[PDB]
Design a protein around this ligand. Structure first.
Ligand code: PEB
Ligand code: PEB
Ligand code: PEB
Ligand code: PEB
Ligand code: PEB
Ligand code: PEB
Ligand code: PEB
Ligand code: PEB
Ligand code: PEB
Ligand code: PEB
Ligand code: PEB
Ligand code: PEB
Ligand code: PEB
Ligand code: PUB
Lengths: 145, 177, 164, 238, 177, 164, 164, 177
């Protein structure tokens, strides 16, 4: 949130209030659909490039010993794992019904998102501008998933 | 996921038949040599770190143009990204050897590995040589026929699991080509 | 487009062959006679508004029936579109004075022109009176030089030969 | 949700992407060019003599099911043979759409447009190998010599390809005999005005598509236009 | 196709203006050294079959992985195809050097060639080097500093046409990258 | 991949037939004659390093002009790449002994070879010199069996029929 | 034949068009360049017995291995047949200076040359030394004019690029 | 095919001699009348639309029997083909004037045409009267003696170019009649 704040008042508000900066990231990745839940790979080789970093992203969903952490859990009652399964396919289907102006917006927004927060080098921005769905599958590492 | 106990149960579910003792003969034989298979998987995992160094440096010494500029294992980022996927293939065939069925391999590691290596410019002819030396390193560790480090084992034949792990490595080879 | 270059680069590409010494020799023709049509270009470009004032009413000189009601030139704004129409064709023959071929004519001026005039009822046999009036309206030491006039007239009656 | 490679249960990204729409525009120009190239055959209200399927009631429906299996075998080509089919049909269409830069522009984008034009432009001026019957055994042995060299890429290394194959089912290839035997007779029993339009257009076809300024290849094509109409593209293995 | 003559036509067609005396001085100076364009492109086509043997074997001796078994220049059919497109690219660059514009390059050669080399497994990182060796050779023959063959030209400056071909091989190198 | 099995099932797939009794009978020929060509396979495989040194120097024994400056054997690494190619041809004739036909030659050694040796300025007459030195160096009951020398050398002079 | 004249008539026949000013200006290249390409015409035709003798042995000076038996330079009538071939080629180079293009070399010397020289055991690298010796022995103001020396050598290394 | 510059090649290749000072007087003169020749083709490309209508309606005013029912101008389909092939042989003789030889007539126009015209029901008497009337229309444009349209040119005798096209029209009017 320090590297998406524009003026120094906004980056001062993100420092003093750490719960604000968490939902500031949740502001910017909903007004620009750079989530995994809006990520549509255009082809099968970009679908696999998305899954190359989800398996790194699930590796922080477990601890360093190998026990499953509490950050990644898809059910708390009987049948809630199926209820979360049958709901997430609907919002995956709603991610395929965007307009052509909405698809081309987030395609240039995902590659924008992956190369200012997650590119210290030339190859990390080499993958982002060529495969924008790989840039959509990079979490902040405060989340387990 | 479909393991060896669950491969047969979707075959019976294609016709909705109760699975019976004519079909457990493949399964009760499979559970009888399960101590051999756990003696087989452990021989791979306990030598798993150098086995990808045994293979990828075997790939470089056979073909020295990969470390040449213009090769796809040239820079130090790329050799790290080849040794990273040297061990993912060995991790995912130890997942298929322990489960007794290659339907953890064909969907969690190779469902789309063909077009991934095509669109990245990864050479297909040298990734066959990266995985075939690990094919010859599996069957030396299953059959305890390693010429530099032999492991202590109980006596008996183990030629079926060497044929099974070699039948997992060619499915890696026939899909990425 | 058809030019001096674009014919021989497309002809050598038919067999997949290199530019031979035949093909460099055709480019040498596009240098000496290039300057003949080049001084016809900006002399036409500096005087283009006065030719269409004489080529516009020449179509209404010998065909004064265009302004009758019931035909496609009946009102004033269609005559203003008719003055716009010949200025496109005098812009197109200014282009082949540069490229030395018939490139900007045969895809931009003739291609489709046989069917848009038969479907919108504009007479091509009366339309060619506007271009062919400018053919004999050519004073070869007073308009421009001499060897510009043997090719600028050749582009104009090519356009007479293309519509009829 | 994450990708389908780990812990999912149904295939996703069922959406019309850029490559599907690029295939969708190219299929529609294939249904426009094959419309327009059939307009020269059926120019009046009646169907012509050469827009026929067969003679036997079971043979007219066998022409479609062969050709529906023929278009699968172009889809079943290898990646090297698809790319050699890609650029060679690009080259033979610029020779087809000769004098226009706009008609040259459209074929360089759309790839199934290139297969649609140069198959139909062969059948618009009837420079096909089926429509020509040579008048004598002088012209026939010239025509029988050239197409055996055109059959020499049906077996590239002595083993047969799929593109030369005509039998797809049990008892399939015998209909492929009699459909072409009737096509050989209808080309022989064609009108006298059309067959001398065939020989002059086929000898104008071979001088621009395969001769390329050669005096010897133009001289045999002007002597034997039946051998010129047997000359095809080398992307066709047959 | 188009050329340098028709490039200013289609730029003026977008504004529908007559090309007057102001913008034709780019082309008035172009016909002044029309002999220089023919004197430059004659050095390329006279050494055209020897430039692609100078470049493909320069690509092999710098990156020896192509002549490894399995590699992209191992089957003798494949080396015949690599020398086949060495003289196709050298044809189409010399087409664009003759016409003065690169409009013949990205519609008949470079159109779709990037995805064709990806779908064939052609290593594009060494395919830049086979183009860049031809860039260093075409810039040596034009200014006549080629250190095994000098030609007979009238004296003057040809650095304006040395960069004309150096911006065309890099147009090939940027499109298939 | 021209082989015994490959050309008999592609002819059946050309007409769309099943493998009939004409097609199973060709594979019956791959038991009797397959004893002889496979017996010469490990004879070439077990002694290949003594072939390409002792029959590879016969290229520059007859054609001694290649070592001179200018031609194709002008230094060490072009001499070293010459011994690699006769070792490439010794694998592809050993690979033809086990496929029962002319498979790996016709794809990996013959097709396109006559355009590579032209543009690389490699004389193919020097290539057939080192092959024909292996063709006549055959003591028939001492290299292999009496009939194994027939089927082994049948691919050698087929290659001289291809390179020349 | 492929000449400057024969290209633009086939381009107009492909389009189905009359010869326009793009095709008309190609023959303008046969006005300024045919004064220099015909300057080197009779210099070869008036001295054709001198160039064949002291460049035909320069084939044999670089390749003296042919005088051994089994090769092509093994008897005198083969050498008498050998000097005829480079006398055939320089006749064809004189035939392409007088035609403007590269027609008579292509139709009569190069087409089919790669099939005869491989089967008859004739080294094309031995052909190309006799051709290329005439290129660099050629003095620019002494043998011919300055622009004719560029013109005559440009047809000469086309044949070097044809054989290699 | 042949042309004028290729005719002295095959006349010299008919005895395998060279092209020296004996055969060059016809060819060193050919470049001198080249600017007469390029001005002769420019005269005939200017006016091809009416001079076929001068010919195919001058055939009507001496022979109205084809507009009689059962003729060859009764059909509007057939009257296009008499206008389409009235200019193709005009296009081929303008090819022959640019080539300096009638080599393109005996393969693309003459050969096959007599065997064509028997299979169409073509009146052979219409063939000779069509070409000879437009023969006089051709030389009227070449010698600038066209009595309803004039043209600006450079001064000099031009009957050698008028006789060369007069040697072309009696070729094609002979065999098909
Ligand atoms: C879950 C599935 C899964 C795999 C199957 C592997 C394999 C794999 N490797 C790479 C990515 C890579 N993989 C290689 C590997 C190789 N290149 C070669 O020349 C050799 C043949 C081979 C090593 C032996 C290299 C060099 C890169 C990086 C390419 C680059 O940086 O441009 C990628 C793209 C994403 C990334 O950047 O990592 C994937 C999916 N990793 C995974 O996460
Ligand atoms: C140019 C470099 C180069 C290499 C890296 C190797 C690569 C290599 N290793 C093996 C063959 C093998 N490689 C290994 C792997 C290992 N061996 C061990 O003792 C360890 C446990 C582990 C490394 C940590 C094993 C177990 C075998 C089987 C033979 C044996 O060592 O007992 C083989 C096949 C048989 C052979 O030729 O040896 C090859 C090519 N060879 C080379 O030419
Ligand atoms: C049909 C084929 C055909 C050609 C090949 C050219 C041949 C050619 N080149 C130049 C002429 C020239 N060529 C060069 C070029 C160069 N000088 C150098 O020192 C550099 C090495 C090189 C740069 C690329 C220069 C500088 C001139 C002089 C400028 C000029 O008069 O055009 C000239 C004019 C002077 C002369 O008569 O020689 C001609 C006719 N023209 C043709 O019609
Ligand atoms: C899907 C894409 C698509 C194209 C690219 C075009 C290509 C095309 N044009 C024509 C048909 C035609 N095409 C032209 C166009 C031209 N002829 C010329 O002489 C000019 C040089 C050139 C303009 C650039 C003309 C004038 C016709 C009608 C007469 C003819 O066929 O020549 C036909 C045959 C149909 C017919 O007979 O009418 C086809 C396939 N049409 C298409 O549907
Ligand atoms: C433009 C108008 C147009 C048509 C009237 C139809 C023409 C047409 N093509 C085929 C059917 C076919 N047409 C071809 C095409 C060819 N075969 C060859 O040998 C040549 C290479 C090439 C052009 C002659 C092929 C390969 C088939 C399928 C097999 C066959 O029946 O010949 C049939 C079915 C009857 C038959 O041939 O058996 C018809 C009517 N298609 C058109 O596009
Ligand atoms: C009109 C545009 C046009 C081109 C640009 C070329 C380029 C081109 N090359 C190949 C085909 C090929 N191209 C190469 C070339 C190379 N591989 C390498 O290692 C080198 C980097 C490079 C040579 C310098 C090879 C090796 C093949 C064959 C691949 C195979 O056999 O599988 C193909 C596919 C068709 C075929 O297989 O022949 C095409 C279109 N040809 C064209 O028609
Ligand atoms: C590793 C192996 C290896 C090779 C095979 C050569 C190949 C080679 N030659 C040149 C560089 C060159 N290559 C040529 C090409 C040729 N020279 C001629 O005179 C002929 C016409 C043609 C060979 C038939 C030319 C003309 C130059 C420029 C320098 C010169 O020779 O004058 C370059 C460019 C160097 C650079 O990029 O800076 C390379 C790689 N060099 C190598 O390092
Ligand atoms: C061209 C036509 C053609 C054939 C049809 C076969 C015919 C054939 N089959 C076998 C011979 C045999 N075939 C079988 C196989 C079987 N036996 C059974 O009862 C099962 C149905 C089946 C098991 C898969 C066995 C077990 C033998 C005997 C063992 C052996 O010969 O290896 C033999 C060797 C013995 C003999 O010479 O008779 C021959 C020639 N070969 C040919 O060349
Ligand atoms: C598997 C199939 C296969 C082949 C058939 C050969 C064919 C072949 N030879 C060469 C390349 C070469 N081949 C030779 C060989 C010879 N020159 C001579 O004078 C003798 C005739 C002969 C040695 C006996 C030489 C000297 C070169 C180098 C030519 C060059 O680099 O320009 C090349 C280019 C790449 C390379 O250097 O390897 C290829 C593909 N190589 C293969 O991989
Ligand atoms: C696997 C393939 C293979 C063969 C085809 C043979 C062929 C062969 N023979 C010799 C080598 C020899 N070969 C012979 C044999 C003979 N000399 C004659 O005059 C008789 C015709 C014939 C008896 C059968 C002799 C006497 C030598 C030793 C002389 C020498 O140094 O060449 C060599 C050189 C290296 C070696 O000794 O092996 C080779 C390749 N040997 C092989 O290993
Ligand atoms: C029945 C009559 C008949 C013909 C008209 C020709 C036509 C023809 N030429 C080629 C084949 C060829 N044709 C040429 C063309 C030429 N070669 C030259 O020396 C000239 C420059 C130019 C003639 C003007 C070339 C260079 C090849 C070989 C490369 C290719 O396959 O195109 C092929 C492919 C099969 C083959 O190689 O024969 C055919 C059918 N052949 C015939 O059998
Ligand atoms: C059609 C082309 C054409 C020619 C090739 C010449 C004809 C010609 N002159 C010489 C003969 C000669 N040529 C030269 C010229 C030179 N020698 C050098 O060392 C310098 C590099 C160069 C000056 C620029 C000299 C000095 C001789 C006499 C010495 C000799 O070569 O025998 C030779 C070879 C020896 C001979 O037979 O006399 C030939 C064929 N005239 C022509 O019309
Ligand atoms: C039966 C009906 C009938 C006609 C339609 C005309 C047609 C006609 N015109 C000419 C004769 C001619 N026809 C033309 C053609 C033309 N003249 C021009 O000035 C234009 C450029 C162009 C019309 C577009 C020319 C140039 C001549 C030569 C005389 C001349 O006009 O100066 C002749 C030959 C006269 C002869 O030799 O006997 C005929 C028959 N005359 C007829 O008797
Ligand atoms: C004139 C229209 C026409 C034909 C041709 C034949 C087509 C034909 N080919 C056959 C059979 C056949 N078909 C082919 C393929 C084809 N043939 C070749 O010589 C080459 C090079 C080919 C690829 C282009 C081959 C090579 C065979 C022989 C193989 C075999 O008979 O098993 C069979 C026999 C199938 C059967 O009886 O089951 C037929 C009927 N019939 C027709 O109506």
């Amino acid at each position: 949130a320090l590297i998406l704040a524009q003026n120094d008042h906004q980056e001062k508000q993100y420092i003093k209030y750490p719960k604000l900066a968490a939902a500031a990231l949740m502001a910017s990745t909903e007004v620009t659909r750079a989530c995994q839940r809006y990520a549509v790979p255009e082809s099968i080789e970009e679908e696999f490039l998305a899954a190359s970093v989800d398996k790194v992203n699930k590796m922080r969903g477990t601890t360093a010993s190998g026990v499953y952490k509490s950050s990644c859990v898809e059910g708390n009652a009987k049948g809630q794992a199926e209820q979360a399964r049958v709901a997430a396919l609907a919002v995956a289907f709603r991610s395929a019904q965007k307009s052509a102006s909405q698809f081309a917006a987030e395609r240039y927004a995902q590659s924008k998102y992956g190369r200012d927060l997650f590119s210290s080098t030339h190859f990390e921005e080499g993958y982002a501008n060529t495969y924008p769905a790989m840039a959509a599958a990079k979490r902040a590492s405060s989340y387990g998933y | 996921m479909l393991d060896a106990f669950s491969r047969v149960v979707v075959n019976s579910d294609a016709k909705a038949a109760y699975v019976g003792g004519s079909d457990l003969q493949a399964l009760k034989s499979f559970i009888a040599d399960g101590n051999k298979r756990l003696d087989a998987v452990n021989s791979i995992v306990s030598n798993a770190s150098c086995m990808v160094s045994d293979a990828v440096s075997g790939m470089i010494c056979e073909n020295p143009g990969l470390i040449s500029p213009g090769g796809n294992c040239y820079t130090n980022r790329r050799m790290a990204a080849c040794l990273r996927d040297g061990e993912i293939i060995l991790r995912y065939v130890s997942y298929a050897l322990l489960a007794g069925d290659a339907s953890v391999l064909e969907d969690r590691c190779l469902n789309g590995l063909k077009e991934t290596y095509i669109a990245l410019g990864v050479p297909t002819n040298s990734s066959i040589r990266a995985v075939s030396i690990m094919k010859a390193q599996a069957v030396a560790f299953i059959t305890n026929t390693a010429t530099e480090r032999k492991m202590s084992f109980a006596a008996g034949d183990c030629t079926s699991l060497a044929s099974e792990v070699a039948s997992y490595f060619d499915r890696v080879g026939a899909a990425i080509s | 487009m058809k030019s001096v270059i674009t014919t021989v680069v497309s002809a050598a590409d038919a067999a997949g062959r290199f530019p031979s010494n035949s093909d460099l020799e055709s480019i040498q023709g596009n240098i000496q006679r290039s300057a003949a049509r080049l001084e016809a270009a900006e002399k036409l470009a500096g005087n283009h508004e006065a030719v269409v004032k004489e080529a516009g009413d020449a179509c209404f000189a010998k065909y004064a029936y265009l302004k009758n009601p019931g035909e496609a030139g009946e009102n004033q704004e269609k005559i203003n579109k008719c003055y716009r129409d010949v200025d496109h064709y005098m812009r197109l023959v200014n282009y082949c004075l540069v490229v030395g071929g018939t490139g900007p004519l045969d895809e931009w001026g003739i291609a489709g022109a046989r069917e848009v005039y038969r479907t919108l009822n504009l007479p091509t046999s009366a339309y060619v009176a506007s271009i062919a009036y400018t053919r004999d309206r050519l004073c070869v030491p007073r308009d421009m030089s001499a060897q510009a006039g043997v090719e600028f007239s050749a582009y104009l009656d090519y356009l007479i030969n293309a519509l009829s | 949700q994450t990708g389908l490679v780990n812990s999912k249960f149904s295939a996703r990204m069922a959406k019309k992407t850029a490559k599907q729409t690029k295939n969708k525009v190219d299929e529609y120009m294939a249904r426009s060019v094959q419309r327009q190239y059939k307009q020269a055959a059926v120019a009046t209200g009646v169907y012509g003599t050469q827009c026929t399927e067969g003679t036997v009631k079971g043979a007219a429906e066998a022409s479609r099911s062969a050709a529906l299996s023929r278009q699968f075998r172009i889809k079943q080509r290898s990646a090297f043979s698809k790319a050699h089919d890609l650029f060679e049909f690009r080259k033979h269409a610029i020779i087809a759409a000769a004098g226009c830069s706009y008609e040259e522009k459209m074929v360089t984008r759309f790839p199934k447009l290139a297969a649609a034009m140069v198959l139909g432009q062969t059948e618009m001026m009837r420079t096909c190998s089926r429509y020509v019957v040579p008048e004598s055994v002088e012209e026939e042995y010239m025509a029988a010599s050239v197409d055996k060299q055109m059959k020499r890429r049906g077996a590239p290394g002595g083993v047969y390809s799929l593109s030369c194959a005509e039998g797809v089912a049990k008892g399939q290839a015998e209909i492929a005999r009699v459909s072409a035997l009737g096509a050989a007779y209808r080309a022989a029993s064609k009108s006298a005005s059309a067959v001398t339009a065939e020989r002059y257009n086929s000898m104008a076809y071979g001088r621009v598509h395969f001769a390329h300024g050669c005096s010897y290849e133009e001289q045999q094509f002007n002597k034997y236009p039946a051998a010129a109409a047997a000359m095809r593209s080398d992307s066709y293995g047959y």
